[PDB]
Each structure stands twice: as C-alpha cells, then as structure tokens.
C-alpha cells in the first residue's frame, strides 16, 4: 500500500523563500589513488600536478591543500628482498629530512607507510610544487593522498 | 573529555598504514548546482539535464545525475504593473507530470519563488539528453538551484 | 461544545502563498475489464485516466497496489479465480498472483503490492499487468497517485 | 512492507464499497478584472475547470475566500481589496477590506465562512464582491468540491 | 494428539479452511555466484541475461531486479603485478562514471571490490540489459551478485 | 530476551551507488534449496482413490524442474468442482511412505453444497525424508472430480 | 442455575454443534504391544515385524508401524547353573546395527531383561516383512514389549 | 535423549501388560433416514473394521452429534432430530436443529451424564433420528471396550 | 544443492562443507554413497562428522 504521510509517493510543493547564497565551484574532500615509477637508490619527487586531472573529476581545480600522504608497493621487489618504501616529506617552506619508512614481513606483500601532515603546514601547493620524494625497491609506488581541492 | 582530540602537533607524523584500501578516483557528488534559463511570457520551458554537467560547475566529467528536488526564482524583474510569478511542472522519462508548482511574489521590487522536492520512488538518474520541469513566468529570466546527486 | 460563530469572520491575510491550481491525488479507481477463456488480458494504464474518475487532467500516475474480483459468474461445476501478473516497463514479471473462491455463488480475488523501489509513473500506452479467469469479467480497484 | 524490494500478494477479501466520483478539498487559485469603484461579483462558475481538474463538478462547499491585489495600485495609492461575502439565503453588507502599507506590496484580505452557511453552490452563483484600485485580484478560495 | 506433549512420530490431522491464496511462480532472492572473462585495459559488460540460466534455477525468470555486486579476481595477476578489478555500475536511466576499484596486497590474493545500488535505482532488468562494466589485470573475475527475481 | 527496543534500518539510506568493502571469495551455491506452497489439480474419479505422483511437483509451471528431489511437509487439499446433485463436497487425504502405507483417511467434508470441501495432513519430522517423480505422496478420494491440492515441501 | 442443579447434570443435554468437523475414521494410535518369540541356543532370531499386525492386538487394521523403543524379557528360565540373558541387535532397513545390548539376571530365578531406544531419524515406518531386531538368549523364549506408533 | 543412535534402556522388572486396550473415539458414519418416520441407530454401526474397532464387542457412549448428510426437499430448511435411547428406558427428547441456509447443513447433538454410560453392544440402540433429507451423518464420542 | 568453495589465495586450500538435516540422519552401509565432489584440484581431503552404529 505504502504511506500517506504525505504522501512520499508523489512530488511536493517546497515553500521556497529569497534566492540564498551560492557557488557552483565549491571545495572538494578527497582520496586521490595514482601510481608513479621509482628508480633504483633514486629518490623520486612526486608533483603535485597528479591530483589535478579529469581521470579523478579535479581538472577543474589549480591548487590542493594536502591533508596526509599514504604510499604501498605497486609491484613485487627484487629476488630474495622485501617490499620496502619511504616518504621524505616536501614544504615550499622548508623541505624536511624525515624518510618514514614501511617493510612488508612476506615477500609476497606490498609494502605500506603514511605521514600526516600538521595543521600549520596545511596550505595550497600547485601544479607545479612537489608533494614527497619516495624511495622504494619496487620500480613502481600506488600512492592514496588526502586532501581539500580549492 | 577533549584533551588532544587526535594528535595536535606541530610537524609531520608517521601512519602505520596497512593493507591497500578500497578506492575510487571518480566517486560521486552531491551538489546544489546554481542556473539560469531565458524565459518567453506565456510559453513553457523544457529545463534539459545537460545545463547540470558542465566544467562551470566541476560537474564535467559526469553523464548522469539523480535529481532530489527543484528550487525556482525570477531572475529578472516582471513586466510593469505585474507581480512576479514562476511555475515549475516536474517532468520524468516515465510520465510527465501536471502539476504547476508556482509562486508570486507579494512585492513588484522582489522575486517570486518556488520548488518541489522529488519522492525517493521516483529518483533515477537523467542524462543530457533528458528534461527537468517546464518553467513558466512573466519575467524573462528563470535561476535554478537544484539538488541533485552527480554519479 | 464544539462549535464556532455563526457569522463571517475576517482573515487577517498576508504574503499571496504558494499555490498550485493542478495538485496531485491519490485514489482507488474502480473499473472492470472483459477477459476470455484461457488467454491473458493486458490492463491498460490508460483505463484509469477518464473524466469518469475525474482523472482527465492526469497523463501519468503512480500505481501503487493492484487488487482484483470477479465480476460475473464461473463456468458451470467451477469455483471462480483470478490471476494478476505485474507488469513494469523495466521488466515483465513471471508471477501470478492466484486467489480463488471457496463457494460458487462468491467472488474470487487477490492483489499485489507494488515496492517503493518500482514505484514509478505509467502513462495510457502502458499496461499495469495481466489478468486471467474463467469468469468473463474482472472488477479491479487500483490504488494509484495521479500527478 | 516497504523493506520488500518486489511485487508482494495481497490477501484481499471481499468487493470493498467503492466511488469513481469522490469529494475533493481544494484551493484554487484564480484572478478576476476589476474596476475602479466598480464592485465585481465573483462566480462560483471560475471553480469549474480542467484547469483545476474541476471540470466533472457541478458544486463546491466554500469554506473561506482569500484576496491580494494582482497589479500595482494608481500613483500616490497604497493598495487595497474589499469583499463582501454573498449567500443565496441573503447577502451580507460586511466589507472585510485590507490595505497595503507599502505600495508596491500587495493588500490582502479574506472572511472565513461559517459552518452553518457552507451550503454548497452552483457555476451559476456568486461568492462575493470584490472592489479595489488594482485593476485585477488574485483569490484564493479554500471550498470543498462535490 | 501429537505425542503427548513432544514432537510427535506420526501424521496429525490439519483443520485446513478456504482455498488460500497461492502463487506457483513466486519471486526468490538470491546470490548468484559466476565467473566473466576480462582482457587487459578494456571494460567488459556483465549482461544481466547471465543471471537467468537453468545452473541457478532461474531459467523460469525473465527479469531480475539488482541490489548488489560483488567482484573477486578469478585468476593470478601478470608476472610482478598485484591483482586489482574495478566495478562502474550500469543504469538504463543512466550509466554511471564510478569506477569502484579494490586491489590485493599480496600477489597471490584476490582483490576486491563491491558496490550497492540504492534504493531508488532497484528496478527491473531484462537479460538484453547490463549490470556493470568490469576492469581486471586478471583474464577472468568472479562475480556474485544480490538480486530479487520476478 | 527484551528484543523490544532498537530500529537500525542500516542507518537510514542514500541515493547514489556506494562501496562495499568485501574480503575474501565467500562460500557459495548456485542450485540452492527452496521450501515452497505448491498449487496444482489432480483429476478424480468416484470412489475409486487416486494416487498423487511427486512428479507434478517438479515442472517450470513451478520453476523446480530443476529439482529433481524434494521432501514433503504437509498436504492439504480441496475440492476443485461441485459435487453431485444433492450431495455436500468431501475429500479424503491417505498419506503414503516408501517405508510404510498409512491407512489413515482425513476426510473433511462441506457443510454448505456450494462451498469447497477441505482437509491436510502434517508429515511428522520423523518421516520426512525425500521423495522423487516416481514415487507418490497420497491417496485422494472425493465426491468431486478434481481436487485442488497445495504441497508445503522443500526442493533440495 | 437455569435448569437448577445444572453442569453437574444427571440428565441429558442438548450440544449446540455447528458446522461438520474434519474426520478420520482410522487414526493412529501408539501402543506398547506384548508378544514371545522362541528362540533356540546360539543362534540369533530375527523378529519380524508383521507380529505387532494382529487382531490379538486390535491392530490387524494396520499394515505400517514406525518403532520407537524395544523391551525385552526372557520369557523361560535358564540352563542349568547358568544366569539368565537375552540380547538385541537393532535392525534398519537403511542399515543394520551391531550392537548388542545385553542384559543378564542377578538371580537365577529372575527374568533377564534389556532394551533399546530408536533414535527420532530412525523413526521410519516398518511393514510385515520388515524385521526390528535380533534376539539371542540362554533361554528358550523372550517376551517382547514394543513401544511403536500404528499408522 | 538428543541423539541419532540406538540407546540403552536399562529395563527392570516385566511390567503390566495389556494387549487389548481400550480406546476413546469419534466415530463418522452414515444411515438413511425416511420422511416421517425414525430411525433406530443401532450400536452394531460402531464395531467395523473401517473403525478399527472390528475387535470390540462393547461400547460405552458419552455423546451423539448428527448432521444432515443430502439436501433437504425443496423449498425446506435442513432440520434433524435426536431422541436418546437406553436399554434402562427410552427418553422422549428430540433435540432439534434446524439449517437458516437451504444449501447448509443441519445440525444438533446430545450428551449422555456420567449415570447413563454403561455400555452397549451391537443389538443396542443409541437413538432415533428424524430428519427431511434422506441421509444424516452422525459422530459419537465413546470409549471401546 | 552444489555448495562450493574457493580459495581466496592460489597457495592456499579450498573448504567447503554441508549439514544434513536430523530428518534425513538414517542410516547407510558401505554401498551407498555420501555426495559427489568436484574440484579443480586432483586430490580433496574429507573429515565426515558421522555416527558409526
Ligand atoms: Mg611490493
Ligand atoms: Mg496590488
Ligand atoms: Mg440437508
């Protein structure tokens, strides 16, 4: 039968009142999955530019707020060795030294490791700015940023 | 409670991430998408779905998008000695509809408004190529604010 | 105790509210169809817009439940019955929906409930379901939102 | 049940008593042209419509009569509407009247008709006069059609 | 008497009334298990005619309303790769852009992915209709989909 | 107990397609069993007793052609036409089993001539094994000349 | 009341029936039936079924009977220096047992008894020629007493 | 207990035997019946092999519930009589019943008081029955013995 | 009924398993058969919960 309250089934009248506040380009929270390719004992700088494309809907957007950076092994490593990556975080302010690093403990598993980024180092970087260098055995790295396109 | 409420630091900290989660790099989006239409006195006006996708409106890389409800304002002011109006008739791929949503409005100097939400039964997605509501008015120009779910 | 004036009273009126002179309406439309012996009947949508329901305004509607009776007698030595198979313009069912009388000289009957998920509108080219009988008539009473 | 994602049986039982004509409680909005100091009697004919899906009846229990001025009021005037509700069993001389305080804002005003007269009435009656100094009058007629 | 307070050894009578409602075809929700073969870098689409077949019973169906769908890769990833699948919902009011993607961490494990279909999008589907586009590294992937035949 | 209270309703609902973090391959099963009322009309003559074949309860007219075993778990059954002159609606229902006949007779009779006689018998847990087309699952004797059963059973 | 002294009546009375009840001129009855087997030194004896089907037992009506549990007691007395014993080997017709539950007198002048109970998913029906069991015993006779349900 | 293999009874002394028992029942059969005329129900009905009870020679009923079996004539209501019989003396009720549909049956029984049930064999009678249609379908509740 | 079971790691086992109902717990002797087995590998190892009597 289903409800009459009221009735649910059918459109309604909404008492719509002054035209309000708009924006048809808002903000935007998101994941960004993107893999990149990593040399051997060469550390590679992950641009910013990535996150900007129409293969994740953001293409619309110039700058990009990073939130936190998460990276896994996206191929298998040399013989005999384990998965292992790492992430040296970058600031147009003043690059950092940290290398947080993840190892898989299976041959056969990726290997993981993230960094947050701090409320005081939240800002926008463009195009043309680099997120982290990462380093890693496996030749290629699947990486997962957070972040508020703006 | 409160204290740190997460971690409230100063540099940067290590995640002990784990397995690869579940991703998705085009999810969707639920949005409330600003529009006009130019508006004839007297004639209906067909609202088509592809003003929805548009890199106006970062929605662009959609072809398809679940309408919840329709808001309407004249945008322009009515002609001399009337009082603005504006009519909204739902329209869906299975059965338009006939009813004439409509509002005045109660001052010469300000808009007339309306809207009408959409019953969860009849919310299935529309392309370009698909119409909204037929809007009609005394005044040339129709804004639209419509809410809707982007997928 | 429970009654006001016997005079008019004013209205202390305001803003000209939203108004729709052509609102929606939710209804239980009684009509019959005319079925033969062993073959099928298409009900057609179109059936439930007519000025006979005050329902000639509508071009769509909202079906909602469909409920089905005899309407004449049943063949010589036969209990009546009725079957309804639901149509939808996404996907014929193959259900048929059977209810059957219990004493010759009594009315066979049965319905089926339409889900919020399927509840869409129909328009007068379309068709709610099918109906069979061995009774040459069938009286339904469809419960439907017209707009 | 609702939980339910397909077609459900129904265990209907016997014929139910059943109406293809019922009542309808309505209101229906319409204009009417009016001139200076001129009353204008409303006819109960304007609520018979396919334009209200009204048009299958004949008569309608008005309940209460709402008015708002349709177009702006002459130079200098601030707007204003009268009604002077009309009955078969005999006219009232009430002239419920609104004014606008602000000119270019509508006046409005309406009556409540009381129990014992909601009699029904006919295409061929009349609801009330309206006057004004607004050319035309948008109403709003709150009535039970049956 | 039953037995006296138990469950009873023998058949007991039934006081059966009027002829009840009946329905020889009723409608039957199901999970249907089955496999699709994927090519690399293309999209296949799963044809909702699979779900009517006699190796699930429901031969007797001709439409299949569809809740939701789960996606398991059927065979190993290429050489060096981790198993991934994706899954972009199919509509006839309008298809979808999600590409709902699940991965393996471990190459000699599935990946998968799952999506549910709201309620508003639960109508009927004819076997000349599709459900979903699959995209897998693994030639084949494992399909089991929650539906409701009638 | 105190199952009173709670609601969930999956944390209300949404309009789009949404995610589902599945895990590992589940257990599955294509051909899964199915309990079932199954409708179907015998043809009977006077007082001569009919025998009613399993075999009917497998046909796509039921969507079990599938099946082809299935245990029973009541019977009941009415008539399907008008007695004779006279004479008020009855049917009797004589269980059958591969282990053992029944000689009982649940007869239920019509008080009114035109209204359906009818009567059932339950299959007590103990007995409910499968059965295939060949076999059979009672005897029905009537007034009537065709008796309309309907077969709780559970295809397997 | 009424008829004074009523209820308790020593006086016919009329029953308002109503509409003709479902019947069942045969129904079912469970039974606990008393019978002797004879059985020789060393060897094993089948009982057959078709032994609880007579009209001794007001049963010769029914050809199915579903056991439940078995009883048994030796019927004569023992050898010679000897205690009395009888055993029960369960059969089925989906398989036979090899049991043998046994029992065996304290007294030589004291009946030997045992039984056995059949579980609820052996509960099938058995006809006459069916066997239930197999009976050894020092002594030349045991009298059985079968707990089954008549169908 | 809850199992699914033969289990042990550890039986004890040879009990009580009986291996004619009696039997409570609700016995269904059929007589004619003539327009105007009684019939005599005999006893004898109660002892037959379609009851089972071919192996009783005595009954003791507790109560008598009839139906009429056929239409009634035409234009008539469906109506039945019981007058209870006993070999102490017969009583002179006629415990009526009457249909208020000419297409349903007629209906009415009796109960026999604690005082008046012994028992009877075959050449007893139960009751007399009076009714308009040619066949009546009677129930006793008795107990076999 | 085919109640199947897949494993979610190439090197690791597939398991599968099925309840009979108390109803149809009778008996069975070494000609009868308890099920069919399928599987893509050429060996499956059983483990039947059974009541030898
Ligand atoms: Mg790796
Ligand atoms: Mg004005
Ligand atoms: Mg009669």
Chains 1, 5 share one sequence.
Not at 74 to 86: G, H, I, K, M, W
Request: proline fraction near 6%; aromatic fraction near 10%; hydrophobic fraction near 35%.
């Amino acid at each position: 039968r289903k409800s009459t309250g009221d009735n649910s089934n059918v459109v309604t009248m909404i008492r719509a009142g002054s035209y309000p506040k708009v924006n048809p380009t808002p903000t935007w929270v998101r994941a960004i999955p993107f893999e990149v390719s990593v040399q051997s004992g060469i550390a590679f700088k992950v641009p910013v530019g990535s996150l900007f494309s129409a293969n994740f809907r953001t293409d619309s957007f110039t700058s990009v707020t990073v939130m936190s950076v998460r990276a896994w092994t996206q191929l298998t490593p040399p013989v005999n060795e384990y998965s292992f990556v790492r992430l040296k975080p970058l600031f147009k302010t003043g690059d950092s030294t940290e290398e947080f690093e993840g190892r898989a403990s299976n041959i056969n598993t990726r290997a993981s490791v993230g960094y947050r980024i701090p409320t005081n180092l939240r800002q926008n970087t463009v195009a043309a700015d680099n997120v982290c260098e990462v380093r890693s055995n496996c030749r290629q790295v699947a990486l997962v940023i957070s972040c508020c396109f703006n």
